[PDB]
Design a protein around this ligand. Structure first.
Ligand SMILES: CC1=CC(=O)CC(C)(C)[C@@]1(O)/C=C/C(C)=C\C(=O)O
Lengths: 467, 467
């Protein structure tokens, strides 16, 4: 039993059952886990106001939501670090204490009366944990919040701040009540310390239109939230360097490529298709396993739906996955001197953008299907290799009983589209018939690529819904 | 001042200077760091006995070296976990306490009188930390070892076990002497507890032929030690499944490929070169950053030299990355029905193996040149793309401005060797002249391949000597 405004600490050794022990009631109940599953690119204020808009009811406007988020940030002592990104182990951001306080404010925006916390002071410095428990006690007492927390091991100053201590050991309960008399209770049984020591250490030793409006609003919200995530890969130094190196390589190798040498242009188009099939799919396959945990945690509270998250993710990724291929095509066309014309330029640009979107959708679907990031990446690589080997440029004599594979590979279709844009039906050129004219036309290839992209998105959505 | 046989600890907050504070004298001094930089594939016994062979002098026989290693293992309570791999965060192995005990025994093989321990107790379970401190105190008392350790925060039972306690704050010493008298001294100064609490928390609040023989023996033991790592560095399904799928789909794509269609076979050879140029290079680029820290720590003690470590690693890699290409060729040659003959089979197998070795050397050199794993991998990808684009199969009309790319690449040489093996000079075949005959001879290409295979490891060695 816990009274409102009382601070309870769940004490016990590792594996004693502290984690497992911890609709209107759930609405006012805020649960915080040990892991700080937060986006590392959003700053403090940005993240808390986003959670405020994504969790608070629609009867509250955006300006007052921002004001409430700012008040929560200032109440948790995050004013100094409000101008810094959250960060993670990879990219430097706020400290561990600030990150844990941001995680607390994530559930504090709903204004919960029953705050359950699993290991908040675990894994941080003595002073950071001391400040965290000071803040938690202040919220519990001054604001009258029913706070139940679990700590693997508290410090002395940390230990002396809980008004209630509940003791677990190997799944059973040993003591419940105030921390001050606890030793006395043990002194009732005959367990007295043999030396000056922290009483916490003894404890361990002894142990319809509205729905559409909400959908659109939260979809735009999640899209704006993931713009920050996409901005990293938009200007990733390694990615930009690789893209510009490939562009310069294509420009120099095919410098002022003529229309007479069909083989050189065919190889250039096939290489472009290979690059823009492998890179987007490989990039997209990593996101879904990486954000799976945070998506599950956020969906458990019911803050947002799966379809809105998926649409926001694809909308955010479209700009990142289209900015680079456009510049790559601009540089390559203006360096290697492919077929002149603004209309062919727009046609090939749209063709490659559609192919890149299809490859990104395939990568997202494969990442959704496989719960392991490395195995999903391996499957993506294998599928892309099987596709490129069936693109019509490496092998010209496909076995009769196997041809259906080249009818499902997107890189095939992209290569045929590129060849059609560069030379048409081969009337000017007229091996030519099989490598230029092809067996699949312009509009049918475009429709097949669009259908493949849409099907990949649908399959990814089905895989996400399966879990 | 610390006397032999006394358990001394250094206490203070993070950043107080505990880390910085902690030839015969250093030969008998064993230093252990916080990080357990150990190979995750060797079992508990295996790495211990190997460090014994690599550290103890040559006047100490192998059988009794193993006996001493077993005695040390049993002395540190590793008998139960001796049949389990050390492991890491990726692959499951021994527990944190067992791993730290293995790290202690790593320096305990040399039998050091002065054991320095830079934060070994930090970040483990209460019972594991208690066992570690009990083992350390037992060693310090019974064996008379001068132990100087550091702890970020000790438990009460842990804290009551040190004979000597040093106290640091912001780089300045505050208290020196026994832990028991620290409370009395601080009370005399005028600092007394306001509640029952652990005095450890109290402290924080205020705060020629012989050389060749040695080279050969240590090279051999290093190679044997690295064999365990090479056993599963890439044997995981992520790569063997990809290789077998590539073999199956390559054999099925060119199923009974004829000798008449030059383009198909040439594309197959080019794709094989592309597959075996980037895969070994990508595999090799990740081994060097990963092992950089452990190599630096192990070289700091002078246990082994740089050249022997390089030779052992290269021998392990050669034993590693030859079976997979051998199986690939063996499947592909018989599935696609290439030119008949055992001698051509051996020729192309040797060519592919040498090409794989050259790619491995390029990857190792690029990984050694760049101190960042991701940057080195990106540079490897860019360079391999540059070599692939200038292989003579994509762009037939290479401009004279950058044609020297084809004179420094590796995929080009492998492709020329493969075509000169499959079709020779083209007399049977006789676009043919440029794509079959070429301008680089078979023996010249083989010599260039071998020269670059040696020079890549030479570059890697010079890069290692630089840092
Ligand atoms: C883009 C990329 C990602 C990887 O993980 C493997 C590797 C580095 C080899 C690769 O360059 C793959 C290239 C492929 C499949 C084909 C090619 O290049 O013709």
């Amino acid at each position: 039993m816990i009274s409102p405004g009382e601070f309870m600490a769940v004490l016990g050794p590792s594996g004693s059952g502290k984690s497992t022990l911890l609709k209107q009631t759930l609405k006012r109940t805020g649960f915080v886990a040990q892991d700080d599953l937060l986006y590392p690119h959003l700053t403090v204020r940005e993240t808390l106001v986003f959670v405020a808009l994504l969790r608070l009811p629609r009867s509250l406007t955006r300006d007052v939501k921002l004001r409430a988020a700012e008040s929560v940030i200032s109440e948790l002592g995050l004013t100094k670090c409000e101008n810094t990104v959250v960060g993670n182990t990879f990219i430097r951001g706020i400290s561990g204490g600030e990150r844990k306080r941001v995680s607390i404010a994530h559930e504090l925006l709903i204004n919960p009366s029953l705050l359950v916390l699993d290991e908040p002071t675990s894994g941080l410095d003595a002073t950071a944990a001391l400040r965290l428990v000071q803040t938690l006690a202040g919220l519990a007492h001054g604001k009258g919040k029913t706070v139940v927390t679990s700590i693997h091991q508290p410090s002395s100053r940390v230990f002396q701040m809980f008004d209630t201590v509940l003791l677990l050991s190997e799944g059973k309960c040993l003591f419940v009540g105030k921390g001050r008399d606890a030793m006395a209770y043990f002194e009732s049984v005959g367990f007295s310390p043999a030396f000056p020591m922290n009483p916490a250490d003894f404890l361990l030793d002894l142990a319809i239109t509205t729905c559409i409006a909400t959908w659109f609003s939260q979809l735009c919200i999640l899209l704006h939230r993931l713009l920050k995530e996409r901005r990293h890969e938009s200007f990733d130094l390694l990615r930009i360097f690789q893209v510009v190196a490939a562009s310069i390589l294509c420009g120099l190798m095919w410098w002022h490529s003529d229309y007479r040498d069909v083989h050189d242009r065919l190889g250039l188009l096939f290489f472009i298709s290979i690059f823009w099939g492998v890179l987007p799919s490989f990039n997209a396959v990593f996101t879904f396993p990486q954000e799976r945990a945070i998506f599950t945690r956020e969906r458990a509270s019911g803050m947002y739906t799966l379809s809105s998250y998926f649409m926001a993710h694809v909308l955010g990724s479209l700009s990142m996955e289209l900015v680079l291929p456009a510049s790559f095509l601009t540089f390559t066309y203006w360096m290697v001197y492919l077929r002149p014309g603004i209309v062919p330029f727009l046609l090939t640009l749209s063709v490659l953008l559609l192919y890149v979107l299809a490859s990104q959708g395939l990568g997202l679907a494969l990442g959704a299907a496989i719960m392991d990031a490395k195995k999903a990446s391996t499957i993506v690589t294998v599928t892309m290799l099987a596709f490129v080997l069936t693109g019509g440029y490496y092998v010209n004599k496909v076995p009769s009983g196997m041809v259906w594979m080249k009818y499902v590979s997107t890189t095939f279709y992209c290569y045929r589209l590129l060849v059609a844009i560069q030379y048409g039906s081969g009337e000017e050129i007229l091996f030519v018939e099989e490598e230029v004219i092809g067996d699949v036309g312009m509009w049918t290839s475009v429709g097949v690529l669009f259908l493949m992209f849409f099907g990949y998105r649908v399959l990814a959505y089905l895989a996400l819904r399966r879990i």
